């Protein structure tokens, strides 16, 4: 385990890698909003399908 950990290690500050979580969140939020608005359009269409009958 330690062998692979040292093999795949990069010379750089650790506090910068964890920071990437912010970027990843900012890039996931977009897709999450797109899923919100798609499940919303879906819901709306559904309620219309239950309005017409």
């Amino acid at each position: 385990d330690v062998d692979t950990y040292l093999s795949n290690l990069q010379t750089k500050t650790t506090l910068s890698m964890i920071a990437d979580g912010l970027e990843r969140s900012a890039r996931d939020f977009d897709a999450f909003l797109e899923e919100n608005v798609t499940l919303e359009w879906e819901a709306q269409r559904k309620r219309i399908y239950q309005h017409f009958g």
Partner: protein, 61 residues
Amino acid sequence: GKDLAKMIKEINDMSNTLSKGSKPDDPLTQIVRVLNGHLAQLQWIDTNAAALQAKVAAAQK
């Protein structure tokens, strides 16, 4: 040289383990490595061939 070799080895270890570390027996690092080998050999070919090409200009007197 020995210490430098150790360093390079460790760098390889860290890069390889960082990029992938849940299957060190996988075919990706394989392709990577072999493909690096090919790159190096191709570079050798290119450079040496260029050298020989340069060597011909001397005979063009």
